[PDB]
């Protein structure tokens, strides 16, 4: 199976209430493993997954050191952007940064990314060739020039294709039981009379991992996309995920509907029918 490691950084200014809030979290596929919170008491990078706890003090001291360097950078960033767009110093603003690498089934480098956003809009992003940038704004072009002159892209490329992939592999290895496992969804259907001539059919998919899944309804084998209530895949809170799809059925027509479930952990795609 394919895998990825991704880091998320959020920086939020608080005019008059002290320093900006800085939060960082790390993920491997859909499992979070570390975090840093500027408002927290420890002031350190912390474990959020059992398999990373076995890393020694050098790991934590190092990660703690670099993560707080990140924090300061985004603290300068907030001021710079304010200037770039001539904004008042009283308004709260947001900066987000995300980066990581994707690896194929052979655990080989597939793709790398490094994106940045100001107040929720794309600002600048490294293109897939890891040699060029996408600047949306005039402000973003100014940043692109700084980054080209400082050869940021080249440093990023070494990181994304080298150490990023390398530590992902190590993590996949060290956390095999949790990161390399595939929990197929436990599925089932519910039927509920909505009125005298209509009924709701809900198809459930529970405790599956990873989160990726395709849940669908058909009437006489034809897709019912527009007449299906499909909720967003959600965390169960124990490392697994859940999701459901529902359609309102005219009483007496239950048999012509089929629910289709596709997931990495299912040997064959499932086809369910109320009957």
């Amino acid at each position: 199976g394919s895998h990825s490691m991704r880091y998320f950084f959020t920086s939020v200014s608080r005019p008059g209430r002290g320093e900006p809030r800085f939060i960082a979290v790390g993920y491997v596929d859909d499992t979070q493993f570390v975090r840093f919170d500027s408002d927290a008491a420890s002031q350190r990078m912390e474990p959020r997954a059992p398999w990373i706890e076995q890393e020694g003090p050098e790991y934590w001291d190092g990660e703690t050191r670099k993560v707080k360097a990140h924090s300061q950078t985004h603290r300068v960033d907030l001021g710079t952007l304010r200037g770039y767009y001539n904004q008042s110093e009283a308004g709260s603003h947001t900066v987000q940064r995300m980066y990581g690498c994707d690896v194929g089934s052979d655990w080989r480098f597939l793709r790398g990314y490094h994106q940045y956003a100001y107040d929720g809009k794309d600002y600048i992003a490294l293109k897939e060739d890891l040699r060029s940038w996408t600047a949306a704004d005039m402000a973003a072009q100014t940043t692109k020039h700084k980054w080209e002159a400082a050869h940021v892209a080249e440093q990023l490329r070494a990181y994304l294709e080298g150490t990023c992939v390398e530590w992902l592999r190590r993590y996949l290895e060290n956390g095999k039981e949790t990161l390399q496992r595939t929990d197929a969804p436990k599925t089932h259907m519910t039927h509920h009379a909505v009125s005298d001539h209509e009924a709701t059919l809900r198809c459930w998919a529970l405790s599956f991992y990873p989160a990726e899944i395709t849940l669908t309804w058909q009437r006489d084998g034809e897709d019912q996309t527009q007449d299906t209530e499909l909720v967003e895949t959600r965390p169960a809170g124990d490392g697994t995920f859940q999701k459901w799809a529902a359609v309102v059925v005219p009483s007496g027509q239950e048999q012509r509907y089929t629910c289709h479930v596709q997931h990495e952990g299912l040997p064959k795609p499932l086809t369910l029918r109320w009957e």
């Binding site: 960082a24 990078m45 990140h70 960033d77 710079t80 770039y84 600002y123 980054w147 150490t163």
Partner: peptide, 9 residues
Amino acid sequence: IISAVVGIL
């Protein structure tokens, strides 16, 4: 692990 690069805007 986290990247050591971090270019200022």
